[model samples]
Target: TLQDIGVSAGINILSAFVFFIIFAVLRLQPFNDRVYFSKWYLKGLRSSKFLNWMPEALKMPEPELIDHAGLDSVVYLRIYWLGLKIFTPIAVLAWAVLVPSMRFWTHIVMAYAFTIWTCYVLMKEYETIANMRLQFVASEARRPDQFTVLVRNVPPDADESVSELVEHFFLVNHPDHYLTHQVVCNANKLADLVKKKKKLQNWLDYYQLKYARNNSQRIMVKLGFLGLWGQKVDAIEHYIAEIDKISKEISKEREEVVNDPKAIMPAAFVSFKTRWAAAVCAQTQQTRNPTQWLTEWAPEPRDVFWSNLAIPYVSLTVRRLIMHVAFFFLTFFFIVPIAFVQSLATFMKSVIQGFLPGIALKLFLAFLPSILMIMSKFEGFTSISSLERRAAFRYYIFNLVNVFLASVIAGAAFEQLPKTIGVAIPMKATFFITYIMVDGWAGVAGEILMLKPLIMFHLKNAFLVKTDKDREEAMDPGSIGFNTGEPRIQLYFLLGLVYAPVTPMLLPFILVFFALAYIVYRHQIINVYNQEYESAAAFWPDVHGRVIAALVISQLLLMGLLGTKHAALAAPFLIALPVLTIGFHHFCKGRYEPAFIRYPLQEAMMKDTLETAREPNLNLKGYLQNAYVHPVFK
Candidate 1:
């Protein structure tokens, strides 16, 4: 069986090698220049040096080049790098010393060493990322987000318009620092009309260009669903008339948005005279009700998800509760489906054999991560960072249940809780080893290919592209999907840690996945992916927290697995590991997490002091006067 595994390992290794070669060639092509390294181009860091070799192409850029893309990109790449740092030594010891010795005391000693070393590594990582986040904030150009706060749940006033109410309230309470404010508009309808008008306008330009190129042939298109059947009309004239109609409606809608008091939302972006005032507003309670004047650091102008900005505070809470319950049901039913399928094991052993089980398992694991991300979006997070963090939370739950518990023991995730964790875990060691090969190794290589984006881009270009702008839209170079991608990597770490003692052979598969992921994703973030927003790796806390959680889970599972293996002395000794691990997590969180979540007052003051010296006569009022105006109004 080990021989068979070795053969499979060789095949996977070769496959991984092939993937690297393909990526090396693909990334160097001029056509892929934008798709691979859009971040570099965005920062004016593009060069011709990439044509040389594959290893050189994946080389790390200057710190400024890395910082320009934001800390999210850098921290994401470090995840796999962290894996390599933590697991490489663990793999060597387990395979060389622990496995060969096959003694209880050896494992017990290594367990303590493992726990201590992991915490030390995590502490270092947390501090490193915290400093990077701080430095990123410190060395940035003055951004509107730094000087503005988003205030929601403005107490609705029947007497005054939202604009007037916001202005009067801020000027009263925050007279020293409050410079200007822009009221959010309930522009949901207006935004849709604007989008529709843009589409029609694009189509109009497309046809006009077509007519210009081929004047000898008149183009006629049906005005109906998919243009399958309808009244025949000249394509150019039809688009022009459609654009004309939408343009007139857009004008009326814009007028309504400006004139109608109801169109103004009870939310406003309040700008401050200094970063300190904005930071204070974001970090403190603003009103007696506590819920009325909710304030937060305003997201960057392009980073704001405008549609969700007007969601009422109460509605946001209710939606979060609903989504939480929905995720619970989703994770529960996730196990139910697999259990039902496995129950037919008696009747369908041949049909459900080998690859089928892995496929069935992989399908649910993959499907749930994306679905959870969608649910997160529906919960109405106004920033991509929050949406992803929520998704990552859900993803951890899904994997902890479906991949960890249910895959090991055939039952609902909750069903296994009351029962003793024994044979169920160690019995599935080989199954998870295969999972690393199939899902972890192969899946990572697939990520480098970016099959979905490639296909969608071509499809859009074929049917949609007309102007240069249309082609740009069709390109669709997506950012690193941290929500889905990071959680799955954590699962690999969990598997590697859990099986290190019981099945050392599985380590190389996981190591292979990590090595491949590091290379592929490094090349990707450098050349291909573009971040939607920068939270300065704000998600690092979640990453650190989850890895600590995984370490604890592995420690507990090892305690159970070793207990069943009749290592009586080691079993009782292991109880202290989880407790110590949790204590270490809290210690790190208290020391370092605030750096990610809140801007330090000292840091803000220093930045302000330096800014005053650098730009002594900066226009505080005029610069921010219209910065937060709703897109519809703009």
Candidate 2:
């Protein structure tokens, strides 16, 4: 009996440890480079090129060492609890291992609850650090003081004419915000006036337009698309629609030379071109084409690309780690269910093999593709085949579709797995996975969508195209093939058709999630990205922080809902989860400390927050000293 238990425990521990090691290694650049192309660890190792340009400090596997060190440091602190839990098996075995004695079971229950609280505390600490980092990075270039002025009363199809109107309006008034850093957010107001969607776009067109023109209303349009929707679609759809509308409007200029879409080119650029009247103004010396301003001024190509790639790592890594830790607790607490599900699935397969033989095997293999299909959608895909690399939008659509499919499939599969295991699912794991995959990944989608369009405009400006057709042709969606003059909708429809089988299962979910994700994404795109505003008013600290919290909460909720079913059955698992977290963290913490000390990047923004509780600051002039000395003054 001991041997059987020991073997299973060993297998489980080693298996988990192996996966964690893979996760840790993947977080670093050097090992990932070595692993990427080598295809080591079952494609775990990608390409060694990842580390080629990374800083030497970042290249080191510091986190892995920290994880190990954290485990070592905290091992003694929790040994008494572990010892009690471990040997309790012996006590139970002697008195009643199968029967569940009252005294021993009480120890199991209390230990689990205590561990969960401890884990929550530990996770919260890390989450705070991560939140600070994310807030700083996201808000770095944003200026909260920036505002948009909506202008209306234009014709539906008169996009170019509306541009002319805006040009006329700005030149006559010459608003101060226009000249200073303050921006006028006037595109959509003009768009609404053009489209004549009065109820849908009326507020900005009717009342908001005047202030925007005069710079009298300096209020920030933090709500980016405050007046465009009719509750017909989700936020993502609305964003997609707005982008489509703007794209179409810009496309009308395909016959003429233009830079980028009217939507993306700052209203300032258009206003400058129009107010100055470059074509006819007597003072104009360098009369460049409209294409020159829009295309050349966007963010640079390499800066855009590297920033995009590093964003996930920078914005996502710490949050991901929090989720991982929280999920570990769920797993630990729900280990019994996991063990049961695994066993039940194996048993079912063995039974099916005895009866139907190949039929069961075929079914399993058939189901594998759907899972892989879902994987393809959730796992990122970018077309790296061409020189002017563009993000694959269709791939993202396909990916979201897949993620929806995966969520549904995973939900069903878990439900089908062992009822006991299903019931034991941890709340933290469920919420975390869902939030990260849906909400967090969706944020990445917004950035990715902008990538291709940004690049195409840049290329157009760089090359100085004469005809609209050449510019249109240059705007390759995937940056793969030379743009042919065929209808583009057919390609989108064809791709939809390719994904037809998958869509039925996932469309509804994708629709819902995209909408939710879009609203939040658009807020950032407008208030932060476009306005260049950085204010705590929008709660920047919680932007990524809440996302991480959402992830952790999702996991905990799911685990608790599923795990409570056979609480006693999973006593060992529940206890083990937090122990693993604290264990791994203890090991990793020490290892990471040296790096944090040696590598400035690790603590660049967070060094002060990561300060030791006992270390007294030498600077007596700082505000912290005041707090320390005036503790009892109140």
Candidate 3:
């Protein structure tokens, strides 16, 4: 009774103190507007600006203010205290749920009270931390320039032309979103900022005729037409008939061959603007590179240190706080059921044996929906700008397979793995590695790394290829561009970002998978950019084979380390793995196939076939199509 009373008293003291904190802060009008009701607090909780600014606001000793031990320790302390206060209600729920004589109805009341308290604490801390970062972190203008220097080195040794080199060089440099405006913005604006120049401007007399001619030629080359919702077959033939009827009137005076060889398919011709702009594009490519700017520049060492460390720790701490609340629910679920089961079961041995497994199974069931949700999330997250809808759907489906496999593994492991932790430490490590680290960090980093290259490559494309008419500019010798073969290496750290979070759980496998994937994928991209193969058929199979084989080997290695009893859990892992490799092809083919068939022919006349087709259904298709046809798709 003393222990119970002490626990309850301690909880009450803590909860009251936290409530006082809330009342004190909200007493101020300005703080109240941010606290009592804030859009960011209620939604996008982690991103609250008020929270990001707080740590800097509380520096009693200015010297200790920026120190990681100083700032982060404060962060951890604040979070830890918040976590305890937050869970007090959950504690009350446990107390009620345990004391049988208090009855089930009383327990429900306790649970609800605790649940509301948890929501409040979550909202409060989410705002506090979100604001804290902005106050302390140095602004970009004040930050040094490591990123600029990093980008400067983007061009590899293999660049054949100056244009190619510039193209490859710019595709991987971008600012981290942490400091790059809280919300996402136009990628083009970002590109322009990075290039440090206004986008190419055009004149009135310049090429409507050229643009129309180029677009008309592109339209005429079509084999079929896709409507708003569907496709029409033999559509090209239908269009040709209309063209012939029109041609009869226009060409009646200049009668030519029935099937004029010239009409068969117009040969691509360089326009005056394109020829002149090619030189300007070349010049712009060489001169406008911002890679040197990104690499040599970086945040102040202190800010960079906090940011890098904070990214991983803040992510984990917030994530862990959420998990503890989840665990409280789990504890309630297990405890309440155990109390009921104890009343029913006669044998203590049966009760003990059955209880943990039942809890485990229930957890497995609870997690199934989460796995499905993650599959959908991954589908959306990994579907980059250049990715086609079909590819996104397929990629999502591929990962779905892994989730299915993981679910099976989770269920089976729940049933059997405790028996095998006794089998060998290394074997157990394998299971731990699969579920915790690989899933957490490696998966996250691998997915994010891609954006760096995608963004930079798009920049390089803009620099090297101009659409402006009237002026004929020569390719500047200083500017270099990618031939679509350049491999983006900056993503390696994106792998680092993901791997950092789960380092404790899976240790090295996340890193291993990333290293292997990068080396293989990077090598393949370089090959394609170089145009080593004369044909696409020769090109794809090797690339596809390497990607799939790498996934197979890496996953199988993870699965092998798991002992036999735990191996049953390996099923879900196996099922989910293929989605990684298969999903890209779907979006790639779906979005690019049509665009690719047309872009080369339509390159002249200053017509961007992909750009012109930017409408709802056509928009996404063209977006992805442009990416695949990107001079640096590899």
Q: How do the predictions measure up, each by TM-score?
A: 0.88, 0.25, 0.21
Query: Which of 1 and 2 is the better model by lDDT?
Result: 1
List lDDT for all candidates, in order: 0.74, 0.30, 0.30
The runs of at least 3 residues in candidate 2 whose Cα sits more than 4 Å from the true structure, single-residue gaps closed, are 1-160, 168-174, 180-418, 422-634
Best by lDDT: 1
TM-score of 2: 0.25
Q: How many clashes would you count in candidate 3?
A: 75
lDDT of 1 by residue, 1-634 (tens): 3443455456656776677677667766776565555566655676444325448546657484465555788888888888988888888887888444256677778778777877888888789888878888898788888998888888887688777888888888887898888878778888899898887876776566666666755434533456545444466666777888988988898887778977767888889998988888899888889889888888888778888876776797789789879987887777677775444322233323333445456675666766887888777877777778888888887887776777567723323444455554554555566556767676677677776776676656555566565545565577688887888888888878877776777787778788877776776776677787877787888888889988988888778767765436775678888889999989988888888788889999999999999999999888888777766666
lDDT of candidate 3 over 244-347, digit per residue (tens) = 55445434423432233322111010111121222222223333555421222112222221111112112445654654465445444543333332232224
Evaluate candidate 3 by giving its C-alpha RMSD to the native, one decimal: 28.9
**Local error of candidate 1 at 612, Å?**
1.7
Better of 1 and 3 by TM-score: 1
Residue 382 alpha-carbon offset, candidate 3, angstroms? 19
What C-alpha lDDT does candidate 3 achieve relative to the native structure?
0.30
Candidate 2, after superposition: displacement of residue 69 in Å? Answer: 27
Q: Could you tell me the lDDT of residue 504 within candidate 2?
A: 25
Q: Rank the candidates by TM-score, best first.
A: 1, 2, 3
